[PDB]
Design a binder for this molecule. Structure first.
Ligand SMILES: [K+]
Ligand SMILES: [K+]
Ligand SMILES: [K+]
Ligand SMILES: [Mg+2]
Ligand SMILES: [Mg+2]
Ligand SMILES: [Mg+2]
Ligand SMILES: [Mg+2]
Ligand SMILES: [Mg+2]
Ligand SMILES: [Mg+2]
Ligand SMILES: [Mg+2]
Ligand SMILES: [Mg+2]
Ligand SMILES: [Mg+2]
Ligand SMILES: [Mg+2]
Ligand SMILES: [Mg+2]
Lengths: 46, 56, 107, 74, 179
RNA sequence: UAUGAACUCUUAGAGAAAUUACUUAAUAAACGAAGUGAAUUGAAAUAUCUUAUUAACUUCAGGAAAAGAAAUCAAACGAGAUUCUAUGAUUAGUGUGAACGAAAAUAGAGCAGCCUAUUAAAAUAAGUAAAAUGGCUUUAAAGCUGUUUGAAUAUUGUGGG
RNA sequence: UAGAUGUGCAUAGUUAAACCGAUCAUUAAAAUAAUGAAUAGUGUCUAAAGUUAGACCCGAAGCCUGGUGA
C-alpha cells in the first residue's frame, strides 16, 4: 500500500526538483515545458 | 546590426583565388553587355521564312 | 505593306524563340551584303554553335553546350511549329538530320 | 599465381631537386616510397612531386620516369 | 593541437576551434580579435571528430554484421583510418600537426603538397577541407609566398594588381607600443 | 483612414519564472531535410523475412521546406525538369514461405526556364568514375558507403547508361 | 467549325511456351492412328459474399522506444 512519503517534505526541495528554473536551463526540461505548454497547462512547474 | 551581418556574410571574398576573382569579374562585364536586339531588317527576313513555311 | 506583315509574324513567335535568334542569328537573316565572321554577337564569339561542345583554348577541357540535348529537342520542336526550323544551327535533333542519317546508313 | 592479388601502391613520382647519393642524379625522375619523400625529402627541399601540371611545364611526358640507382656515387 | 611557431610570422597557426590567441608579448590594441571568415558549407552536423582534422569526405558509417549460416543482422560501425601526422608546409616552413586520414595523405601527394591541397577552389575540395582545413587555408593566405604567388597569377589572368595585411597590423602595434 | 497609452515573467547577468539587478536586452508547438533507428505483430512456433527506410530521439532550416531543368527514360518509333493525386498494379519481379513490390505510359492539379542564373555562382570539374573486399539498398544492373587501390578527353565516336 | 484524346472487359482456341490457328498440344518426321478442349458479352441498381484494412464487440500478462522520480 501507499506510504507517507511527503512527511517532513520541505518547499525548498520542490523548487529545486520541479521548479521552473530547473526546466528552462536543461535540455530535457524544455520538452516538459513545451509539452505542458502545448496541452494548455497553467502550472508549468511546481 | 545588419551592416555587420552583410559584411560578415561577404567576409570570405578576401580568401578568393586568382581564378575565382577572375570569373567573378567577367559576369559584371558579361552582364553589362546586355541582350542583343533584332533589327527591323532581321525581323522582316524572319517573317518571310515563317510565311513560306506556313502559307507558301 | 507586306514587309510590315512580315515583322508582325517575327514578333508573334514565343519569347523563347526570339531570344535564341537574337543572340544566335543565322547568316540567312543577316544583312544582304554582311559577312558571317564580322559583326558577330557576343554569344556567337564565345561559341559559333551553342549546341555543339567546344574545347576551351587556354584549358584543354571540353565545355558542355549552352543548350543540352533535351533543350535542343524543345527548340527544334518549338521551332518546327512556327516554321523557323531552317534558322537553327546544325543539331542531331533536327528532323532532317535524324531522317538523313537513317536513310544514308540505316540500321 | 591467381587472377586477383592484393592491391599495392608502386610509389610517387618525384624529380630530385638536388643530387642525393645512392638514389639518382639531379633532375632525375623515378618512383620512390611515399614515406621517404613525405618525411625526409620534401621538407628538406630535396625533391618535388611530379604532378601532371609539372610534366607539362617541364615539357616531359609520363614516359620519362626512370629507376632508382642504388650504385650512384657523388 | 600544439603547433610549431612560424619562423618569421607573429600570427600563430589557428587553433582547432578557430580562435587565434596572440601571445602576451605581442602588443594588441583594446578589443582586437583575429576572426577567420565563416566556412561556407558550415560545420558537419554529424561526427564532430571530422571538424578538427583533414578527413576528406569520410565519416563514421553504420551497417550490419551478418552471420555465416543464418545471416542475422546486427548493427556495427565503420571508422575511418584516422592518424595524426606532421605535414610539411612550404609556405609556413614548419610541420603542421593535424589528424589526417590515409586517403587524404595520398591526395596531398597527388596534388604536390599540403599547401596545394588547401588552395584548391573546386567545390568537391572545399567540402573535403572542412572547418579546420578552411582555417589552414586562411593561414597560408597570409604568408608572403602565397601572397606573392597569387599576385603573379593575377597578371596572367589580366587582373589589376592588388588593403593592409594582417601581418602589418601586428607589426604596427609593436611600433605604436613604444611611442 | 490616422493617432496617445499598452505593466511584470518566459526574454541581459544571477536566482527557488513573474524577484533581484539592470536596460530603449526580446520568436512556442505542428509541418521539412539529414543522421540514428527499434519492438509489439504476421509467418498459425521461429532465426532470413515481415512489422519498417515505421514510431521515437538528435541536429539544422523556412514560412513553407525538400526536389528540380537529364551522364533521365525509351527501343529502332519517340518522349522531354521537379513536386502532388489516380490508373498502370493483389502486375513485372523478389522471396523456401508469409508476404513485399516497381517503371515506362496515361489522366488531372500546376507549368518556367536558365548561367547576363534577375542577387551576383563554373575559367566545365581526379584520389573523381571505376575495381577488389566488408555492408546498405536491391532483381545480379544502377545508386550509397568504410578499407586497400585507381582511368579517359567529344558523333572525326572520348566518357556514362 | 473541325479533328483527336483518356484504364478496362469480351470478340478463338491451344500449349510449359512461342510459332501456329478452327484448329492446337504429345508422338524426337509428319500423317482424322490415338486423347483432351469451340459459340453473348458488358454496365448499372438491390442484396448476400471472398480478400486487405481495427474488420462483429469487450478483455490480457508481457515486448520495445522516449521521458519522470532518491
Ligand atoms: K513501495
Ligand atoms: K565525434
Ligand atoms: K553496384
Ligand atoms: Mg524526509
Ligand atoms: Mg605500401
Ligand atoms: Mg529580467
Ligand atoms: Mg535570465
Ligand atoms: Mg510455419
Ligand atoms: Mg508475380
Ligand atoms: Mg563535365
Ligand atoms: Mg561509386
Ligand atoms: Mg554496366
Ligand atoms: Mg556508374
Ligand atoms: Mg486468347
Amino acid at each position: 500500500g501507499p506510504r507517507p512519503t511527503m512527511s517532513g517534505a520541505t518547499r525548498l526541495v520542490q523548487k529545486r526538483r520541479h521548479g521552473f528554473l530547473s526546466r528552462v536551463k536543461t535540455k530535457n526540461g524544455q520538452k516538459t515545458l513545451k509539452r505542458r505548454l502545448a496541452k494548455g497547462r497553467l502550472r508549468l512547474s511546481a | 546590426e545588419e551592416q555587420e551581418k552583410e559584411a560578415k556574410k561577404s567576409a570570405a571574398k578576401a580568401m578568393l583565388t586568382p581564378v575565382q576573382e577572375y570569373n567573378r569579374k567577367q559576369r559584371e562585364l558579361r552582364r553589362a553587355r546586355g541582350q542583343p536586339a533584332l533589327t527591323e531588317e532581321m525581323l522582316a527576313k524572319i517573317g518571310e521564312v515563317v510565311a513560306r513555311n506556313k502559307l507558301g | 505593306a507586306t514587309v510590315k506583315q512580315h515583322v508582325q509574324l517575327a514578333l508573334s513567335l514565343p519569347p523563347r524563340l526570339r531570344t535564341f535568334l537574337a543572340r544566335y542569328p543565322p547568316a540567312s537573316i543577316l544583312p544582304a551584303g554582311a559577312d558571317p565572321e564580322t559583326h558577330k554577337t557576343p554569344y556567337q564569339e564565345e561559341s559559333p554553335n551553342p549546341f555543339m561542345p567546344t574545347k576551351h583554348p587556354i584549358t584543354g577541357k571540353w565545355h558542355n553546350p549552352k543548350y543540352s540535348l533535351r533543350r535542343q529537342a524543345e527548340l527544334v520542336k518549338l521551332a518546327q511549329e512556327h516554321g523557323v526550323e531552317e534558322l537553327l544551327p546544325f543539331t542531331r535533333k533536327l528532323n532532317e538530320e535524324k531522317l538523313r542519317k537513317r536513310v544514308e546508313l540505316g540500321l | 599465381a591467381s587472377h586477383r592479388m592484393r592491391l599495392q601502391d608502386q610509389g610517387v613520382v618525384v624529380r630530385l631537386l638536388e643530387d642525393i647519393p645512392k638514389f639518382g642524379r639531379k633532375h632525375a625522375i623515378f618512383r620512390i616510397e611515399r614515406g621517404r619523400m613525405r618525411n625526409e625529402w620534401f621538407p628538406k627541399n630535396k625533391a618535388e612531386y611530379m604532378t601532371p601540371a609539372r610534366f607539362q611545364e617541364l615539357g616531359l611526358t609520363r614516359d620519362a620516369i626512370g629507376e632508382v640507382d642504388r650504385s650512384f656515387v657523388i | 593541437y600544439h603547433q610549431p611557431r612560424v619562423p618569421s610570422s607573429a600570427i600563430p597557426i589557428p587553433n582547432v576551434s578557430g580562435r587565434v590567441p596572440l601571445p602576451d608579448s605581442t602588443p594588441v590594441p583594446e578589443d582586437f580579435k583575429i576572426e577567420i571568415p565563416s566556412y561556407p558549407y558550415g560545420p558537419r552536423r554529424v561526427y564532430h571528430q571530422s571538424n578538427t582534422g583533414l578527413y576528406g569526405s569520410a565519416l563514421i558509417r553504420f551497417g550490419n554484421n551478418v552471420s555465416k549460416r543464418n545471416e542475422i543482422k546486427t548493427r556495427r560501425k565503420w571508422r575511418p583510418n584516422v592518424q595524426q601526422k606532421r605535414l610539411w608546409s612550404k609556405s609556413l616552413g614548419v610541420f603542421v600537426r593535424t589528424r589526417v586520414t590515409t586517403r587524404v595523405l595520398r591526395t596531398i601527394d597527388k596534388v604536390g603538397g599540403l599547401d596545394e591541397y588547401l588552395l584548391g577552389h573546386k567545390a568537391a575540395r572545399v567540402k573535403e577541407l572542412g572547418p579546420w582545413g578552411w582555417m589552414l587555408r586562411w593561414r597560408i593566405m597570409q604568408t608572403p609566398e602565397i601572397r606573392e604567388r597569387f599576385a603573379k597569377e593575377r597578371e596572367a589572368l589580366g587582373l589589376p594588381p592588388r588593403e593592409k595585411s594582417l601581418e602589418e597590423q601586428l607589426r604596427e602595434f609593436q611600433v605604436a607600443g613604444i611611442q
